[PDB]
Amino acid sequence: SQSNRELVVDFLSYKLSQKGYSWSQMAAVKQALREAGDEFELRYRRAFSDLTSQLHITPGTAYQSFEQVVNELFRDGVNWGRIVAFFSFGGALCVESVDKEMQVLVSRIASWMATYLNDHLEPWIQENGGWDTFVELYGNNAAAESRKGQ
C-alpha cells in the first residue's frame, strides 16, 4: 500500500528534522517554511490581529478575495518574508473557509497558490538563490530564534 509508505516517510522525515537532518531537500524546505509561517503568524497577530479574523470569502468571490490580497502583498516587491506571508495567508484563507463550511475552497486555494508560485514567485526565487537559500536563512526556526533573543 502506497498509503503505508507515505505514512512511514512522513514520520521519518519528522524525526530526522528534529535532529537537524532531513529526509530530502524538499523536506528541509517544508520544515523551514512551517517554522517561518508560525513565526509570521505570531508577528502578524501582535501587530494587526489574527490573520484569519479579517478574511472575507464566499465560493462566488473566493478568487477575488485571494487575488485582492496577493496582488497587494507583492505589488511593490517580492522577498522571502513576503513569500512566507503568502503561504500564511493561504493557510488562513483555508482555515476560514473550513470554519464557514466552505471546505470546497481548500482545494481551490491550494491550486491558486501553486499556480501563483509557479508563475509569479518562481522567477524571483530562482534569481535569489532558490529554496536552498531560503533554508539557509530560515531553517532551524531562525526567524523565531531571532525575535526570542531580542
Binding site: 478575495s65 490580497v69 497587494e72 506571508a85
Partner: peptide, 21 residues
Amino acid sequence: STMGQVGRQLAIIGDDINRRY
C-alpha cells in the same frame, strides 16, 4: 478594498520577518 488592506499588512510583516545574509 478590505482584502487589499490585508495584503498591505501582510507585506509590512513580511518585510519585518524578511532575512538577508
